[PDB]
Design an enzyme around this catalytic site. Structure first.
Site, PDB file in Angstrom:
ATOM      1  N   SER A 197       0.762  -1.229   0.000  1.00  0.00           N
ATOM      2  CA  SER A 197       0.000   0.000   0.000  1.00  0.00           C
ATOM      3  C   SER A 197       0.802   1.294   0.000  1.00  0.00           C
ATOM      4  CB  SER A 197      -1.027  -0.001   1.154  1.00  0.00           C
ATOM      5  OG  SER A 197      -1.975  -1.038   0.880  1.00  0.00           O
TER       6      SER A 197
ATOM      7  N   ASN B  35      -9.008  -0.478  -0.618  1.00  0.00           N
ATOM      8  CA  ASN B  35      -8.501  -0.581  -1.984  1.00  0.00           C
ATOM      9  C   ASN B  35      -9.575  -0.286  -3.024  1.00  0.00           C
ATOM     10  OD1 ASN B  35      -6.102  -1.537  -1.010  1.00  0.00           O
ATOM     11  ND2 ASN B  35      -6.618  -3.693  -1.277  1.00  0.00           N
TER      12      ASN B  35
ATOM     13  N   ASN C 199       5.880  -9.576   6.181  1.00  0.00           N
ATOM     14  CA  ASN C 199       4.880  -8.620   6.675  1.00  0.00           C
ATOM     15  C   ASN C 199       4.813  -8.707   8.186  1.00  0.00           C
ATOM     16  OD1 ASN C 199       2.538  -7.149   7.268  1.00  0.00           O
ATOM     17  ND2 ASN C 199       1.166  -8.579   6.232  1.00  0.00           N
TER      18      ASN C 199
END
Ligand SMILES: *[B]([O])([O])C1=[C]N(C2=[C]C(Cl)=N[C]=N2)N=[C]1
Length: 358
Positions: free
Chosen positions: A61, A149, A340
């Site tokens: 992102s 999104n 992540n």
């Protein structure tokens, strides 16, 4: 690097990599406008390939900041207005809930509850039309923020319609090329595959999968050098020669909405500097960042404030990224990892480094 920058970066990032079991990481600190680079560990564990300054990471992102700036450039070109109805650029979007929903609302997640993800079932352009036509808002536009999104991704797709360019071609020609980001890609070319790190999720090597609005919402891959140049450009937009891009950068750092102490830009999010570290660290946890929150309109939007902490987190299934900078101090940081790991750990590390150098 100066020893002070070396020492703080190493003292912060080494324990972070150990605590989070991060396979590979690259960091750039921009100090008095100049970049300094650091790398650790593995881009590819199996093949024993180290992270280098040329390794490509999935930005997740953080890609939304490029979409925000590209949209900014399109506004500056006079191609679109943020006050325009969504239906001006997508006339087949005829359902009545869309009346009142503008490109501003899409760009800033305030359309009234568009979902975080586009459903996996949605592939085709007709699948997308049907999804948006059938979507029902929970809230009036411009009342609640819900990071999504399906919101900013539709903004990016519509923003480039008048140019006639595909989103990727527009991004390439209008943002990456003028800024000399020659190793930043929406689609990684075969010639650069050798540099594309694997991400690691539960110990498995993974790359991001194709999805609707992927390019616009989470699909950029880049190196630590190009991301430093991205930060330099957003720190000092007035030094960019291309006039509409200079303006588009400034527009993406304007403050459109406030929730708590954070302000929503186009892609970028901002807080007044000096910041409360607890506020940015705790605020970055997905329990806050992904929550539905009432917003106050900033009427009219405040133009880019130099005294700000400007930042964005990013993740994909196998990667974790963070960018932050403070225009007033000519200072910033990029952290790219191929795991992540929790947002608050990223933000805590960045604040420890920037606070020590500021
Ligand atoms: B962003 O907050 O990092 C982000 C990334 N994604 C995402 C979605 C899918 Cl389907 N695949 C990879 N990344 N959503 C939000």
């Amino acid at each position: 690097a100066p020893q002070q920058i070396n020492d703080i970066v190493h003292r912060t990032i080494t324990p972070l990599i150990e605590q989070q079991k991060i396979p590979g990481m690259a960091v750039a600190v921009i100090y008095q406008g100049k970049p300094y680079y650091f790398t650790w560990g593995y881009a590819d564990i199996a093949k024993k390939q180290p992270v280098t300054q040329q390794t490509l990471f999935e930005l997740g992102s953080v890609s939304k900041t490029f979409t925000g700036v590209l949209g900014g450039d399109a506004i500056a070109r006079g191609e679109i207005k943020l006050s325009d109805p969504t239906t001006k650029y997508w006339p087949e979007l005829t359902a009545k809930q869309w009346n009142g929903i503008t490109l501003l609302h899409l760009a800033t997640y305030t359309a009234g509850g568009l979902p975080l993800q586009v459903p996996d079932e949605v592939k085709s352009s007709s699948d997308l039309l049907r999804f948006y036509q059938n979507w029902q808002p929970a809230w009036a536009p411009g009342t609640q923020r819900l990071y999504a999104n399906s919101s900013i991704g539709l903004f990016g797709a519509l923003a480039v319609k008048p140019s006639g360019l595909s989103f990727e071609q527009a991004m390439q020609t209008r943002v990456f090329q003028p800024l000399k980001l020659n190793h930043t890609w929406i689609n990684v070319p075969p010639a650069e595959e050798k540099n594309y790190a694997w991400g690691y999720r539960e110990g498995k090597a993974v790359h991001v999968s194709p999805g609707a609005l992927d390019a616009e919402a989470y699909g950029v891959k880049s190196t630590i050098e190009d991301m430093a140049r991205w930060v330099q450009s957003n720190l000092k937009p007035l030094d960019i020669n291309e006039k509409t891009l200079q303006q588009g950068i400034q527009l993406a750092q304007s403050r459109y909405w406030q929730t708590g102490d954070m302000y929503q830009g186009l892609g970028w999010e901002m807080l007044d500097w000096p910041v409360n570290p607890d506020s940015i660290i705790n605020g970055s946890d997905n329990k806050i960042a992904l929550a539905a929150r009432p917003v106050k309109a900033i009427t009219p939007p405040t133009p880019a404030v130099r005294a700000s902490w400007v930042h964005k987190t990013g993740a994909t299934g196998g990667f974790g990224s963070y960018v932050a900078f403070i225009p007033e101090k000519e200072l910033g940081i990029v952290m790219l990892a191929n795991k992540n790991y929790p947002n608050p750990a990223r933000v805590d590390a960045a604040w420890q480094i920037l606070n020590a150098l500021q």
